[PDB]
Amino acid sequence: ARAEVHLRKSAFDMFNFLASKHRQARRATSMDLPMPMRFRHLKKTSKEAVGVYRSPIHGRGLFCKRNIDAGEMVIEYAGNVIRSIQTDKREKYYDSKGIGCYMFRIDDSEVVDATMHGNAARFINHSCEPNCYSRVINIDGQKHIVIFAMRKIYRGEELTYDYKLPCNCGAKKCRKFLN
Amino acid sequence: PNYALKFTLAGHTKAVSSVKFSPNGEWLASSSADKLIKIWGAYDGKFEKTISGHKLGISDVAWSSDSNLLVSASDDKTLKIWDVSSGKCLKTLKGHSNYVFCCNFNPQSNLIVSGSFDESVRIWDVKTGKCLKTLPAHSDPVSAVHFNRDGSLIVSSSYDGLCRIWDTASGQCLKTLIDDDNPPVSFVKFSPNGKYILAATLDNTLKLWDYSKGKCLKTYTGHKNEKYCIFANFSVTGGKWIVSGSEDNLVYIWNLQTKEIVQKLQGHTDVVISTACHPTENIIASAALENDKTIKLWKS
Amino acid sequence: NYPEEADGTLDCISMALTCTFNRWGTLLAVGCNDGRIVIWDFLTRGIAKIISAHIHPVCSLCWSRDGHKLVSASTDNIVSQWDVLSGDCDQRFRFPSPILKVQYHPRDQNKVLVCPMKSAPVMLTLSDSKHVVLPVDDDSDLNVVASFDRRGEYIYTGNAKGKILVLKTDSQDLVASFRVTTGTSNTTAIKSIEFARKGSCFLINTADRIIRVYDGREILTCGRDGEPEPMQKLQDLVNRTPWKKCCFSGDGEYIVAGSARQHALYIWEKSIGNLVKILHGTRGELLLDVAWHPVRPIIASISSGVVSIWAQNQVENWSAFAPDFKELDENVEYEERESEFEDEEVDVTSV
Ligand SMILES: Nc1ncnc2c1ncn2[C@@H]1O[C@H](CSCC[C@H](N)C(=O)O)[C@@H](O)[C@H]1O
Numbered sequence A: 001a002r003a004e005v006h007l008r009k010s011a012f013d014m015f016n017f018l019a020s021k022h023r024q025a026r027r028a029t030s031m032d033l034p035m036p037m038r039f040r041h042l043k044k045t046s047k048e049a050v051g052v053y054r055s056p057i058h059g060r061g062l063f064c065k066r067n068i069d070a071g072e073m074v075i076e077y078a079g080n081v082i083r084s085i086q087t088d089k090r091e092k093y094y095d096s097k098g099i100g101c102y103m104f105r106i107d108d109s110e111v112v113d114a115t116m117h118g119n120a121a122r123f124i125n126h127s128c129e130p131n132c133y134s135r136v137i138n139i140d141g142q143k144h145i146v147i148f149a150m151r152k153i154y155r156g157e158e159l160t161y162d163y164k165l166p167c168n169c170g171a172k173k174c175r176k177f178l179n
Numbered sequence B: 001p002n003y004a005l006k007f008t009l010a011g012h013t014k015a016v017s018s019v020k021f022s023p024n025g026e027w028l029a030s031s032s033a034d035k036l037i038k039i040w041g042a043y044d045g046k047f048e049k050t051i052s053g054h055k056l057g058i059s060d061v062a063w064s065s066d067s068n069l070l071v072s073a074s075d076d077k078t079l080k081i082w083d084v085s086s087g088k089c090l091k092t093l094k095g096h097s098n099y100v101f102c103c104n105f106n107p108q109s110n111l112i113v114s115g116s117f118d119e120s121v122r123i124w125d126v127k128t129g130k131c132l133k134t135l136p137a138h139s140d141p142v143s144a145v146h147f148n149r150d151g152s153l154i155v156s157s158s159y160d161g162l163c164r165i166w167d168t169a170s171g172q173c174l175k176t177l178i179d180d181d182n183p184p185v186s187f188v189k190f191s192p193n194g195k196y197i198l199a200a201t202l203d204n205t206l207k208l209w210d211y212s213k214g215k216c217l218k219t220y221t222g223h224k225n226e227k228y229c230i231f232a233n234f235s236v237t238g239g240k241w242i243v244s245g246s247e248d249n250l251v252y253i254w255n256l257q258t259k260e261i262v263q264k265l266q267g268h269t270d271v272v273i274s275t276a277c278h279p280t281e282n283i284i285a286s287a288a289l290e291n292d293k294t295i296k297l298w299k300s
Numbered sequence C: 001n002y003p004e005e006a007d008g009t010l011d012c013i014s015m016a017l018t019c020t021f022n023r024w025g026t027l028l029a030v031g032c033n034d035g036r037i038v039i040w041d042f043l044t045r046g047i048a049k050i051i052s053a054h055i056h057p058v059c060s061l062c063w064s065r066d067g068h069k070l071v072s073a074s075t076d077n078i079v080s081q082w083d084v085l086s087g088d089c090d091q092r093f094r095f096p097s098p099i100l101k102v103q104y105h106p107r108d109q110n111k112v113l114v115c116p117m118k119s120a121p122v123m124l125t126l127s128d129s130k131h132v133v134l135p136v137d138d139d140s141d142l143n144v145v146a147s148f149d150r151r152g153e154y155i156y157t158g159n160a161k162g163k164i165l166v167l168k169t170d171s172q173d174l175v176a177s178f179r180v181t182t183g184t185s186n187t188t189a190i191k192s193i194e195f196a197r198k199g200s201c202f203l204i205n206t207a208d209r210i211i212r213v214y215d216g217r218e219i220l221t222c223g224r225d226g227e228p229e230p231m232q233k234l235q236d237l238v239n240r241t242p243w244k245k246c247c248f249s250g251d252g253e254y255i256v257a258g259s260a261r262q263h264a265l266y267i268w269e270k271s272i273g274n275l276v277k278i279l280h281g282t283r284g285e286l287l288l289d290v291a292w293h294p295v296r297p298i299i300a301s302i303s304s305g306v307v308s309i310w311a312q313n314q315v316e317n318w319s320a321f322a323p324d325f326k327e328l329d330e331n332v333e334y335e336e337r338e339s340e341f342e343d344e345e346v347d348v349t350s351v
């Protein structure tokens, strides 16, 4: 009230989602339809099946409002497909800038960064007993990081997979090592 | 550049919350958190009335364009609406979970923007008082907002260096004023045409940003503004002066043509948090916090 | 732009009959079964003003050239000029008790055109109680829908037999007249005559459930007794879908039409005129009225007092919240570098 100059001002976050509320077989990815049909379904339906909400696990997350089936596709981790030595340059850069580093790879040649270019798959937390995993698929010569499910993922459950460092997983199978 | 002290509007019992002119240019009234919105005159400091009838203190009072209707951003987390003409308890409007720090009006005088400390810019109704919308503004409380020349935009003064020019009708973030620094943005306002931005970041440097292009043009040197959310103004009645409050017991008024120290006014005994300009004539509102409790009529 | 999803409603007042936006689209008057003067605000989605007027269902309503005067038509032939300040009666005399349309001249709130049910359209002055009856060739239809154009030049009087007859607003000049048949068996009962907001591209609703787009410029080019082909024929493909009301967009770019059967509504354009979206709804609801807003995709849908609104095509994304974030569509591999390592006095009050 105009006299007590208070702290807790800067956030160091490029995104600003923290609102007052932050309200957290038919489909081809569960069918035996071919991989181009599943991949064409994935980009059209990851925009409308899941959503980004504020995460009590860590930061902001991916809180689905739908009974996600077992083994099906959920989201595609698409961002800056940079070379493997541009990884260290952007790691030093966003160490100097404070933005969190998001570098999950396909192989040991080029690593998908998710800092400038990215999607809603930046907001995937880590549970050591997760509900998803990933498999390297092949579409049109390109490779795509596709998050395949594990079980029936209910309404409200945040989406996590195995990344392969103490985590906020909350699970009892916790490794605390992600190197 | 010869603003001379005329009178003293003494009578305040706490830190003077605001000193803003009426839109008729005839009522430099004032308020404080003592539940005493002290309605004073403009040319001599003649007493008119005092609005009371709150529960807790008062943060902000804002002027409707008829110089009469006053909404109070009172610290009991209400939006109690009062009047220069009558002073009736018109609408007591609760709803905000934290302190309603600042309040402003559109130039159409039919919306109540509510910059509270609850990190949610809600909008309220003049006639009845419905919570119209709720802007997912920031992870920071709100210190200052403003509408443009008609009321179609909402500028934000966040605390992590963000000035999001919000839409008013559809109500989404249109442009985010970006800065690699994250200063506590204190008091933003649109230009009187609606096409330039004066972002008062707390680095002892005022920043005039373009709205169309978006880059800074001119700054100011040699002023003390780091802690408090010191208000800045625009003055074209004399020169192109920029009226602002002070912390070293001055009245910070300098020119965009000069950008340096060319005129200083003096006499306060506390931090001047609120300043204002007369729209036509050369009357400048200058009043500090609790250790002054006086309003000093500077006049060229 | 083109409104898509649910958006809720403002069902604050029941028994709603008709609805009209002002000159700027920004006000709204709804005469009801009792026929009250009920006014709203739109950004607040709140009620502006309620004034009780009569007991009858007030059918026809129209604003003024400034958007500040009004007109009414109840069941008892009450045809006055009304106001938005006080809203008081000026004129009232005999008509046949079913009344269809009154219509100000779009450049003069003196000239008004009264269209009864089974009578000739009669043009009245509003200086006094003068009335001018427009000529009817048939006098067997007694159903000749007439309307001023958007500017104020001509009156387009079309019977129930598909015959077009154009009259000038003061001298009844037959500068154009024709008739239309398609899939030629006979003519068609003309359902309505429409007009856009930008220019003169317009259309005609016909009882064959087919909507044909026209333009008055080529009509005046052919003049009288030409063969004006439609710009675009609009209809339903799978089914019949009989129509109750059609309307343009706020400039005449989209064309959205309201069915009379299903409460599931269809959207077209003008240039392409594609069925871009079926706006669905509850099947157990009777659509009664449709209104459209100029600068906003408002669908004012009166369904027996229920006035429901669908207003979208604004989908939020990033790079306005966080402009550093560059949303790729698919995997963009690149390298941004080929080598990976003044005192202008600008006016701030320039109005
Ligand atoms: N479950 C978890 N517990 C703790 N840290 C996690 C985590 N999941 C991911 N992280 C780490 O935390 C970072 C996420 S950034 C935090 C979320 C988001 N940026 C926001 O606050 O809006 C990543 O770099 C990741 O390495």
Ligand SMILES: [Zn+2]
Pocket: A126, A128, A166, A167, A168, A169, A170, A171, A174
């Ligand atoms: Zn963990």
